[PDB]
Design a binder for this molecule. Structure first.
Ligand code: SF4
Ligand SMILES: [Zn+2]
Ligand SMILES: [Zn+2]
Lengths: 431, 182, 294
């Protein structure tokens, strides 16, 4: 009722980049090449056996994460030697470690501990005293290098916190120099109103897709939300798989006129899918022979290449997860986004939030960020935004539905080699 | 004996039904658990709402997987009993060293064996053939190995297929024999 | 060959040369380990109690193999899925026990002995055809002569094998073996030698096979003991392997109690005297023995 009678349909709630006309048109995915970013590491494309984690394996994965990031930072900063975190230090020493909270609550400036890696510290921890640090921004699981002293052997006092070093951007090949600008419409779940299971917002978005004919449509989960009031109280008369199959058929068949490449990203809130992160791609739907080349069932997180433009995307609410734990000396979202980019992982928070199941071997294998993406799609319960963080266009299109009321989606234009202005324009628009 | 039993609320009467075996009752009065509601005044058959049973089973499996991946650790020392989500990299020969007392090992609150046994139990409470062979007696087996229960057998097979599918994706739980023998 | 099978397990008997490469579950690991430990302990107990050639030994060993579901009989049908499963069991369990039984020389010897015994039994249950198949699959190359060569040396073969009739000989096929393996036959001149090979008809052969097996197995155990540090770090498998060898797989005392209440006064007196002096004259012995029989 409330959604159907909305009056702000099509309103542009946020804008960035070159001004464009009131109407956006795309190439219908004609001269479009969508693939997974070809990096050294193989992508997650199939289910991996889970529910069996050895504490030793988790220890090894965390330790190697710290060690690898510290090695890269040491080469970049020309640091001579790292020192064990636990040992006393009367003079200033450089220490590599990861941040954490001394208790189970939320991190605060008086509850910070630094845990070293196995190579340099035997995994030992030390309390941290942030009284002598003038500026800082710390979240649990953050790999840091600090110059400080430990006079009592019991409390590390940092004096310098080395800044993060983001990965270099992608240097596109000339193969896509002559390709036109590409239009991407991105939306995130939930796709149905809190009190309905009819997917009205999804129908409106599909109508928008057919109207504007974008080159890529990135749909992020959930598609059958686990927190939907109907799902939790067991009022559904059909199986979860059937509802999800109906939703996917609606999406794929309804986009036939647009000829738009669909990129489907699962969510941890998908009640019908495996609850593990990194999430494998959906595998319960077989597109018809006429839609096989258009539909891309990708994994969470995903690094996509679109005519040379690298788009990073994750369904996980990274900003909400890290905002609850980040502590700063004095834009918060920009700080968190820079933290994500500099840590070079799509989920650097450790321990994770209570709402995400992390398989740490798969996390090690499939969460490293190959490069710094040209566009980074990070849907969040927080407010929509389009930010420029260290040259990367971070887009939060919100969620298509916000409770009983309609939500928002985003549309942006990407061209490889433009001007670094790989993102010509971007807009958060209302549904 | 330490596994949670399958709780299903009747859609009609709303009374909880606890399922711990494929079959309920003794002798010729034995029938599959999902044939009749636990409330005598209730005539609703849970086998009618098998879609709801499937959905509740999937939700329960999600709940147990979430419990396992929460990664809660408790100190084995009675005088410490420190409970943390964070796994420290400082290990003794027995496992992670508790950072509250620095003298005892942290044990998983919900180990992999617990989740594996829970999934195996959910498979057990829907294993028609196993119940017939092992649990059920001779006269009861004869009474249950006839018609009038074929539909219930098919529905139970479908419900067991879900737990089998979940277990097929479990590593427990995996031993790589290549790493052992070289 | 249902879903994920292959030619990896041609024959029932094997020398256990190639380690398994699969990824198995912890439950499967434990089940296989314990089951083969039961099998080997049964082999040891039956060897102590009975003569290994005895029929009681064979019957009890067959019963144990059937109870634990291990391959013991051939099947001239094909590689049925169930059969495949059994063979897989055998192959994995063996190596698991190797990991369990390589830490100490004592243990090693024990393992070897039991394994040899089992192998011998299984060989004893192999039909000649199957036997040859086995001898081929492992490149043992113990003959098999052609029919044409057999006719070529017909008279020599006839005079070589004791008590072999013309037609019956025509119904038999020989094998070619290096003479270094037929020492016990050549030494008393009961098998023909031609160009360094003995022509042996279709009891002693098992011995040679076993010798080879034992050599291999000893070598393997040495290597396993050399590769122990890699396994000790896997806590999951440490409680099992480190302690598998010590893994569990009317009463006289109450008589005194009976003496309190049920025993008639005669037996009470006899029992009191017996426990006081640990000796009874003949009459007491007879009376008390008959009562305890009763
Ligand atoms: S002989 Fe023993 S049982 Fe019989 S009357 Fe005497 S005391 Fe009683
Ligand atoms: Zn009822
Ligand atoms: Zn403790």
């Amino acid at each position: 009722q409330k959604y159907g009678s909305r009056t702000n349909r099509g309103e542009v709630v946020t804008t960035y980049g070159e001004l464009q006309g009131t109407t956006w048109n795309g190439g219908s995915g004609s001269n479009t090449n969508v693939e997974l970013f070809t990096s050294l590491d193989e992508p997650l494309t199939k289910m991996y056996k889970f529910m069996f984690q050895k504490l030793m394996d988790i220890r090894e994965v965390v330790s190697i994460k710290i060690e690898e990031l510290g090695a890269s930072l040491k080469d970049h900063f020309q640091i001579d030697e790292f020192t064990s975190v636990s040992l006393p230090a009367q003079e200033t020493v450089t220490v590599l470690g990861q941040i954490g909270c001394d208790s189970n609550g939320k991190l605060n400036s008086k509850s910070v501990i630094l845990e070293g890696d196995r190579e340099h510290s035997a995994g030992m921890q030390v309390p941290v005293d942030l009284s002598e640090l003038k500026d800082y921004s710390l979240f649990p699981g953050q790999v840091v290098i600090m110059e400080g002293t430990n006079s009592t052997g019991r409390r590390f006092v940092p004096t310098k916190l080395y800044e993060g070093v983001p990965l270099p951007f992608h240097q596109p090949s000339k193969e896509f120099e002559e390709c036109p600008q590409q239009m991407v419409i991105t939306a995130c779940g939930p796709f149905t109103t809190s009190d309905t299971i009819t997917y009205d917002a999804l129908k409106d978005l599909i109508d928008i897709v057919n109207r504007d004919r974008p080159d890529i449509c990135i749909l992020l989960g959930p598609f059958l939300d686990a927190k939907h009031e109907q799902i939790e109280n067991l009022q559904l008369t059909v199986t979860f798989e059937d509802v999800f199959k109906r939703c996917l058929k609606m999406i794929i068949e309804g986009t036939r006129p647009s000829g738009c490449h669909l990129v489907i990203v699962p969510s941890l809130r998908d009640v019908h899918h495996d609850p593990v992160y990194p999430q494998p791609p959906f595998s319960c739907f077989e597109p018809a022979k006429e839609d096989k080349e258009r539909v891309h069932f990708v994994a969470d997180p995903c690094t996509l290449s679109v005519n040379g433009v690298v788009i990073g995307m994750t369904s996980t609410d990274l900003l909400f997860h890290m905002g609850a734990e980040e502590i700063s000396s004095s834009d918060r979202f920009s700080r968190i986004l820079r933290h994500i980019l500099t840590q070079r992982s799509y989920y650097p928070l450790y321990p994770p939030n209570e709402e995400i199941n992390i398989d740490y071997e798969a996390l090690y294998s499939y969460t490293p960020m190959p490069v710094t993406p040209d566009v980074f799609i990070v849907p969040s319960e927080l407010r929509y935004f389009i930010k420029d963080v260290t040259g990367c266009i971070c887009i939060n299109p919100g969620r298509l539905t916000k409770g009983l009321v309609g939500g928002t989606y985003a549309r942006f234009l990407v061209k490889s080699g433009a001007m670094r202005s790989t993102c010509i324009s971007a807009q958060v628009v209302r549904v | 004996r330490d596994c949670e039993r399958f709780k299903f609320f009747c859609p009609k009467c709303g009374t909880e039904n606890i399922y711990d075996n494929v079959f309920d009752g003794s002798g010729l009065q034995i029938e599959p658990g999902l044939k009749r509601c636990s409330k005598p005044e209730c005539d609703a058959s849970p086998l009618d709402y098998v879609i709801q049973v499937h959905n509740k089973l999937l939700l329960d499996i999600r709940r147990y997987i979430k419990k396992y991946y929460s990664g809660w650790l408790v100190c084995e020392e009675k005088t410490c009993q420190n409970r943390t989500r964070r796994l420290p990299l400082s290990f003794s020969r027995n496992g992670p060293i508790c950072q509250a007392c620095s003298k005892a090992t942290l044990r998983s609150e919900y180990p992999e064996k617990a989740l594996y046994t829970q999934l195996c139990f959910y498979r057990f409470i829907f294993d028609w053939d196993y119940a017939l062979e092992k649990v059920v007696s001779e006269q009861e087996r004869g009474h249950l190995k006839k018609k009038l229960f074929q539909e219930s057998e098919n529905q139970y097979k479908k419900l067991k297929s879900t737990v089998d599918q979940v277990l097929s994706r479990s590593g427990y739980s995996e031993v790589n024999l290549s790493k052992l023998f070289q | 060959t249902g879903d994920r099978k292959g030619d990896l397990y041609p024959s029932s008997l094997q020398f256990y040369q190639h380690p398994p490469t699969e990824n198995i579950s912890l439950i499967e690991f434990e089940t296989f380990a314990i089951e083969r430990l039961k099998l080997l302990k049964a082999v040891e107990n039956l060897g102590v109690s009975y003569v290994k050639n005895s029929e009681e030994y064979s019957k009890k060993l067959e019963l144990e193999l059937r109870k634990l579901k291990f391959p013991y009989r051939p099947l001239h049908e094909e590689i049925s899925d169930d059969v495949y499963d059994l063979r897989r069991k055998d192959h994995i369990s063996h190596f698991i026990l190797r990991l369990a039984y390589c830490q100490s020389e004592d243990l090693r010897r024990w393992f070897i002995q039991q394994e040899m015994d089992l192998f011998k039994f299984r060989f004893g249950l192999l039909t000649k055809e199957s036997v040859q198949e086995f001898l081929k699959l492992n490149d043992l190359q113990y003959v098999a002569i052609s029919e044409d060569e057999k006719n070529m040396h017909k008279e020599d073969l006839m005079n070589s094998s004791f008590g072999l009739s013309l037609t019956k000989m025509e119904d038999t096929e020989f094998y070619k073996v290096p003479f270094q393996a037929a020492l016990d036959l050549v030494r008393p001149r009961k098998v023909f030698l031609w160009r360094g090979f003995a022509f042996i008809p279709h009891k002693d052969i098992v011995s040679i096979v076993l010798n080879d097996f034992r050599a291999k197995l000893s070598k393997a155990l040495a290597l396993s003991a050399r590769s122990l540090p890699v396994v000790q770090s896997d806590e999951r498998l440490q409680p099992l392997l480190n302690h598998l060898s010590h893994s569990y797989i009317i009463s006289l005392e109450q008589i005194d109690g009976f003496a309190a209440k049920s025993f008639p006064l005669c037996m009470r007196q006899l029992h009191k005297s017996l426990r006081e002096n640990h000796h009874l004259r003949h009459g007491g012995r007879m009376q008390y023995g008959l009562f305890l029989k009763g």
